[PDB]
Design a protein around this nucleic acid. Sequence first.
DNA 1: AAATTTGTTGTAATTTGTAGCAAATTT
DNA 2: AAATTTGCTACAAATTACAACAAATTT
Lengths: 98, 91
Amino acid sequence: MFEQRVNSDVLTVSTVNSQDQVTQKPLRDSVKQALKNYFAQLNGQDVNDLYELVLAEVEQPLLDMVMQYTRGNQTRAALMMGINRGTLRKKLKKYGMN
Amino acid sequence: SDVLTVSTVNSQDQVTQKPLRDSVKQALKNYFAQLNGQDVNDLYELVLAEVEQPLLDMVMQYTRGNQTRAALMMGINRGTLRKKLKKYGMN
DNA sequence: AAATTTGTTGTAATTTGTAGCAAATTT
DNA sequence: AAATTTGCTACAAATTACAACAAATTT
């Protein structure tokens, strides 16, 4: 049949292992490190906007990449993403994607 | 100038930071490449699911299970936070 | 010329926030 | 014992979806 591909491996950045050997690795692992570092490199100062902080860093390059793919076509990009065309528009405005 | 980043070695064994968004973008460049016109039905709920999970895990790790403390770190509401833990069943 | 997509509605469906209380847990 | 956190629970408010349409643009 077809081999399984668990949701972790659907979106993967490529890393380098103990030997000089390139290898895919789930994206969530990168989010994991970004925060391991974010906490380490912060040390004591409180934060109150971590979700929105994270959200932005993700939302932008998604929108960026989907609009690239639909060569600017908002209707289809909004279908691809599964959000309404109206909320896509609002996001893009938020991120000055215009 | 930028707070969310990830370490990257290059061919000269020099580790070096770069923003998480660059990494996200790659992920997608690659996603699309694979599918040859297979339509994507819910790409947002997918990505979001790949980002929420590890964020939930790490704040809960940081706040030592303290939901009240986490939900205030993130800027969401405890209710929401509980509801998202349910979504991925981290409970 | 035809089919699609945009920009713009008001309106309704859903999700998140608010607060407040007794019970459980940490301090 | 006192303080903090949990697991609820209406209800309010903010966000998202809907659906319609002329006008703009693409095919």
